[PDB]
């Protein structure tokens, strides 16, 4: 996260890391068997790392659990990035405790102005690269569809919303995709795309989770 802060060890127990030899995406835990991430993060043989603060150091209470199933939303558009949401079933259940916990799906779409928590292990620089060891967090309000469509003219769908600041400076970046966007103790968004990082008038674009609670509930029961 560009312009964020140090969260502290396991202050975000539902933040999980997607691993393919390296960290390539973030993820949210919804139960002891399923992870909510972005559709464009789909790979072959994903490894899920749960309960971790430092990705370059073994903490002691981590859980490395393989992916046995990955399901992309059928209406996911590869170009418009519409319906950018994917569920990942864990091969074995995860031991839920303090360090490792899930997060509740929303029952209502949050309104513009609601302060959200954005978390991840992405790039921490608007220009150049700086990949952290420790998990980075950020506080960021929800922006209006007016502003969100002003930013990206004709690129915002019904399943998307912008968060961050029109001023810039603070934003999610490369390596944060699939990461959680939490509002009022419930998961509202997913780190999707944008134009660069922390750029003026181009805030972060996030997948609207409240439009997929039904599909999430249906997918878990079916698989």
């Amino acid at each position: 996260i560009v312009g964020g802060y140090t969260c502290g060890a396991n202050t975000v127990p539902y933040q999980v890391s997607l691993n393919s030899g390296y960290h390539f995406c973030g993820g949210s835990l919804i139960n002891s068997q399923w992870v909510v991430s972005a559709a464009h993060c789909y790979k072959s043989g994903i490894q899920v790392r749960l309960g971790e603060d430092n990705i370059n150091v073994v903490e002691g209470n981590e859980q490395f659990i393989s992916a046995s199933k990955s399901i992309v939303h059928p209406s996911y558009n590869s170009n418009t990035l519409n319906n950018d949401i994917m569920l990942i079933k864990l091969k074995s259940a995860a031991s839920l405790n303090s360090r490792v916990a899930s997060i509740s799906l929303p029952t209502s779409c949050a309104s513009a102005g609601t302060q959200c928590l954005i978390s991840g292990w992405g790039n921490t620089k608007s220009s150049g690269t700086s990949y952290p060891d420790v998990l980075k967090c950020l506080k960021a309000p929800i922006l209006s569809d007016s502003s969100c469509k002003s930013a990206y003219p004709g690129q915002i769908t019904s399943n998307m919303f912008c968060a961050g600041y029109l001023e810039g400076g603070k934003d999610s970046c490369q390596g944060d995709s699939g990461g959680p966007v939490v509002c009022s103790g419930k998961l509202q968004g997913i780190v999707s795309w944008g134009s660069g990082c922390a750029q003026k008038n181009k805030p972060g674009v996030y997948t609207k989770v409240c439009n997929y609670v039904s599909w999430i509930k249906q997918t878990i029961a079916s698989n």
């Binding site: 390296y22 972005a38 690269t129 795309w193």
Partner: protein, 67 residues
Amino acid sequence: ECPGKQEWPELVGEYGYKAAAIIERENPNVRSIVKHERSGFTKDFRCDRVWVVVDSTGVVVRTPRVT
């Protein structure tokens, strides 16, 4: 770390596709993608991808990094 060459600062000022060719030529593990700077970028991290960011004129205005 990612395998091979990571950055191409010397390719700033070249035309996008020439840069793409050179990039794939020097690091046979990446897929160079030429894009405009006002277009959208996904926020995933890949060791096999090198964005070649250009502007309206198709010239590289940003250092092609492996992300």
